[PDB]
Design a protein around this ligand. Structure first.
Ligand SMILES: NCCNC(=O)Nc1ccccc1
Ligand SMILES: NCCNC(=O)Nc1ccccc1
Ligand SMILES: NCCNC(=O)Nc1ccccc1
Lengths: 348, 348, 348, 348, 348
């Protein structure tokens, strides 16, 4: 017994859609949903999606309010659709997937993922919901997340962090570390050995190791000195060269976090989505140095050190593929006389 | 248990709102309501009101599908609101009135007209609906329409025609002639002795008397000759002078209907509504004669003849008030040497 | 090398998309596409779809400009998508189908119909285009139209009429009669023995038989007298009873065409689309008789006569299914004492 | 003392802007202007321009309500701007020109055409307004229209017809024939000896000569027989060949008017504007013959006869330039053995 | 070979328009540009201008990504248009100028500034681009910026700061100090002796002299004591009187910066543009003192001290013109008994 008036009632009284019965009066003026809160109109939802205002209002209200895998993780694992839930893409103010299953009649391609329409698309299954583990076992294609062990299935320990209502966090009061399982054409998969991006902010960056505390506390030539990083171009790649017209290096988030405490800079996110490697148009406000496409990746500093140290420095330029967030991230490794000139994530 | 999905279901399955239960999936794109009719979107309603698309969609679907008094008649009788119905302005694609009573939660000022909010408003009562005659008796202000007699209430036989879903007709299968009753401050006000406009189109004009058949068939100087209309300026007022830069006279619809069979002309309705006197920006396409404000009124030709003949032709210019459609329409009667120079509905 | 500027160039110089190279300057204001035609903006396309203005502009410009099966025929044959073409719904100003194949990158689900995404969808194949007959043979699901014979494939002679740029016509300079072929699950399905709706207008109705000329020329009780239609309720079903508040019968377009010459009436098409049975909210402007859902079907008069005469008139009410336009149209046949009380296309 | 409320007051009380003082309350909902006409909103103007709703509302209200040269004539004479008036494009619901002079502050580039900004623009001068003849004499570039003689200035008798509020007419009550004068770089340019298009409609076409009455009344092979048009392909060019898939010829409006009485056809005006040669996407509804770009020009039949007969028929294909409406319209004259194969307005 | 799909491709892959070939699929939904980044739509640009979404998307992507003079500087120097570049007005989310030269076909008035259309408008020339110095020499009117010396031309050292992608900075990695050259009607100009506004933020204000460090560090009556500012009303003008209903003085940004560390206040920028003197509706959140138009100018404290000290204090009120940012800023100097009562930038 779904309706715009019942969906808005749930937003008004339960904070989101809770299946409760009741209706509040709604008015729609363009791409914005309002409700008469005694006399005057109070805005419940502003549509920022490509979907019709009422269809997207419902999807937003029927979003998952539990910690779910980050959109980048789901996209890297070829997830197409979610089973009986809406993964809200909080960085895009839109539903993460094209269609739904058993959620909104207007976006729904199926009511249950058992239907032939779902057979070819990798349906996401939340093992924390009743019966979704068995739905994954019978599903032709899928991605399952579980909190604990699944009999028979070989687990793949995912990232420590998950998204709770847009907030990317490492849960303490809730579990955010999941077991990943992927299936392709009925065959259970052996997920790759992978690294995970730390998914941190520039404003609230916090070091997650002793190397990260030493990088943020110690001066440039003494962090490298302590960690034997001579000839790995950390001064260029991680610290960033702000001396010339084009901003040099600055590809690890920890370097942007360190440059931030001292001086600010503009990061223009021209493709605002969730990806393992993010591209920014940076302008360092102090020096005036700038770059149009500056690929910034947030790896744990020890992980980037372990990646660059596990490399061959003989050729001038080669493509270094690294499995990060279940995806093959290509990097361009530039060299000269046994040392790194630059090592940035490849612009593909 | 009202909702956009239940209103749209009723539009799809009953042609309008019929109180039936059920829901169809709806999408709102700007000011237009669509429903997925197997695979693709079919438009159910295009919003042309100043109300939000969904609020107006509901009002339109909950419109009166029975013959109701023409909007001009309701406007002349100082009607402000309708009791438990929506009177639709098919001339402007919008509800004839600002607020509702027991229809739409978003426009509703009351559920029943007995409430104190309705006391100073002239609520329209349809005596054809159960209990609306008594609601008129207790209502402080109102306008009642009945098919037959109401005990004690002095009747006022209204126009032969009524609006059935936009179609202004003289009913045969239904009753379009009503009894009018008005009350102001709790006192039943006596309705004036009035004329009624024939509410006809220019494309489908049809004469409604022998004088009207003689006017549309005979030549100019022989219609006047037969009906002794010498000295009343019917050549200017009713026939229309298309000889100078400014179009002369042409104020009776029957004259526009006669000029239409021979030659076309552009009538720019710059204030699109239903009024007893309509103002048009006319451009006669044959001669090129034109007028910016040309007040055109559709009275029965015999009625205009009976109005002008009964007028005193001694003074040069006087204001002639005539009760038409329950409103006092002022006219400017111009004269010279015992004859009418011009007689037009006065520009206030 | 597709672009909004190349699509608009083709609209400006070729009348539609013709694959020609070149670009005209375009501006987009809301849901409307304009081109600067020396100094000022001339409107090339007004978006009436639920697709983005530029995505729909391209689909409209890349429409099929050859006679194609009417949208109702394609909808009755379960057609979901078109192979490398856009079938335009001129009745709703929008593409007849949700997605495209090898036409627009933004709507495209595939470049060629051979792809696994097209396997469960009924792809429409135009046998008049090179290689589309073989594509139908290999396609898991499809609907093929051919001008002549296809070896092995059992033909189904479709309607005489087809849609040429919105114009439903019976071609003389072009072939509008096609051979239909349908396949489901990789199996060529036998098309039913069917009737075809004449797809005519109310304004320009033209009789297509001697019975139709006799119906439009003769009086009521002498058309029935000549065609021995005693006891079949043609006075109610085909002629229409305009005597009571609710309009009786009037379910054959030929009856609406005959009532039209004498008097006008309002037909509110509340679900604007192309269907075998159309539902209208009729208001006869002369009598005032009206119906909310009046199912009107345009069969050839001889076909409706042949359908009703062959029916058994013993039971009071039975569901009469008739195959019209490849769909099983249900009808409710009401009877009493060996004669038809009413026989209308059943309201599901 | 200009304002949206004063402009709307003038629209409401004078039919257009008349410089009168006063203000009515206005509301703007999207691209539409409304005024509260007692209780409810009545629409005064729907914006169809690329200008802001209020800026265009004012331009429309301050339009020229006198007969002015047709937009095509002004466009052919290189007119860029109007002096202290707004020439309205009733064919596109927008001001014919980009900027204004002494009309709207928001579009105004100058208050008077004497200003240096107007010097390289061809300002249109209406000699019927006080002082505009002298403004033309001092204006570096301009186009002047006068009713009578201007001393020293060599006249160019323009078309018999002019546009009066969208209505293209040959004035009787007003003068529609003007004297044209053009100046370029401060030098009075001699206007060419030209033909004029008759500017007629397909619905209300009326012959304007004995040849045109004979063409619309007589059969094909006897109109040509009477007017000695053997060997000029009037059967193809003017009559139109509806026998093959592509519609042949049909380039004179009189041929479309003659084909119209018998059978209808769809003319898709894909570039909606006023031009000497119009391009249409025609689909003959009877035969099914069609053309994507069918250049249709409305010349007087005698004028087209006089153009084609005077042409040399020796070469296979040559470009025939003809001065029509002050513009050199190119035509492609195709020939074989002393006769015309085709003669159409050339597709540039 | 320009197009919406090529412009968006460049935004997606190069961070801005870089002339690279390629096309990404785009959808336009109202005033917002999106691109399908695998499955779902990612927003590339939200239109905040008065230009059509696609025309303004292109201008934004084709913006100058090098340090250019601040919009206020260009407006003060009468710059009308830019030569073969787009100066983005980052404070207005729009292109700084009406038209373009050799950038966007839809805004372009010329391809090269040598054209007669550019002769009367002051074209901005960037001497850092090849051949723009010579274009300035031949240009009738222009404003040239060079990094170094131009033979013959007398330089005018502009501000230390320039705008790099919205970021107003004093370049270290790039040059931001330019040489200004202006030309009027072919005559090279002697630019005025001028002051420059420091163009600083309230959040990140940084002192740029010893007087500014003493003002931000020292208490009120000891800064004045040290700098002999007795009788110059710095307590009112620069410090600000927050004791009465109307906020007194507070006209120098350094005073707003000092009041900010202690307590916050609301600055309503009701005309959000870049001007030498900015007008704000201030409300001091601590005291409740407020002003509707509070003219705030960011001069270096030593410059304001040198301006007020270089004044005559005899008359009660006079207009003090000061050349700041190449424009004549008027100030109202109020006095009594040989001292300043107030000295604020004049409200013109
Ligand atoms: N002829 C005037 C018709 N227009 C309206 O009736 N507009 C309206 C309706 C409801 C609320 C506000 C305005
Ligand atoms: N009679 C229905 C026609 N309407 C449509 O066909 N709408 C549409 C087209 C493409 C994508 C989504 C909706
Ligand atoms: N047939 C073209 C008519 N369209 C316009 O004239 N558009 C317009 C008007 C004023 C400013 C910008 C565009």
């Amino acid at each position: 017994a779904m309706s715009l008036e019942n969906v808005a009632f749930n937003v008004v009284n339960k904070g989101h859609f809770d299946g409760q019965q009741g209706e509040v009066p709604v008015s729609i003026i363009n791409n914005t949903v309002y409700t008469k809160v005694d006399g005057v109109d109070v805005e419940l939802f502003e549509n920022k999606t490509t979907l019709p205002v009422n269809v997207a209002f419902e999807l937003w209200a029927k979003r998952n309010i539990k910690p779910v895998p980050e959109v980048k993780i789901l996209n890297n694992l070829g997830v197409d659709i979610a089973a009986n839930t809406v993964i809200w893409d909080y960085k895009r103010d839109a539903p993460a997937h094209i269609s739904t299953i058993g959620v909104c009649s207007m976006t729904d391609i199926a009511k249950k993922p058992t239907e032939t329409i779902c057979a070819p698309l990798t349906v996401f299954f939340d093992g924390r919901v009743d019966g979704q583990v068995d739905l994954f076992r019978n599903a032709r294609n899928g991605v399952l997340i579980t909190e604990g062990s699944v009999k028979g299935l070989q687990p793949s320990v995912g990232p420590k962090q998950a998204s709770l209502n847009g907030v990317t966090l490492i849960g303490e009061a809730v579990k955010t570390q999941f077991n990943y399982y992927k299936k392709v054409d009925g065959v259970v998969q052996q997920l790759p050995e992978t690294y995970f991006t730390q998914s941190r902010n520039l404003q609230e960056f916090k070091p997650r190791s002793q190397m990260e505390i030493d990088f943020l506390e110690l001066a440039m030539d003494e962090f490298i000195e302590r960690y034997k990083l001579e000839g790995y171009a950390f001064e260029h790649i991680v610290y960033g060269d702000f001396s010339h017209s084009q901003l040099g290096g600055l590809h690890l988030l920890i370097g942007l976090a360190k440059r931030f405490k001292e001086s600010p800079f503009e990061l223009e996110d021209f493709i605002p989505m969730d990806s393992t490697v993010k591209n920014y148009f940076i302008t360092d406000a102090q020096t005036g140095s700038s770059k149009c496409v500056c690929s910034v990746i947030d790896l744990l500093l020890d992980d980037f050190v372990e990646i660059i140290k596990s490399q061959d420095l003989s050729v001038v330029s080669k493509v270094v593929k690294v499995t990060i967030d279940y995806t093959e991230i290509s990097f361009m490794l530039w060299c000269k006389d046994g040392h790194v000139e630059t090592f940035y994530p490849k612009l593909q």
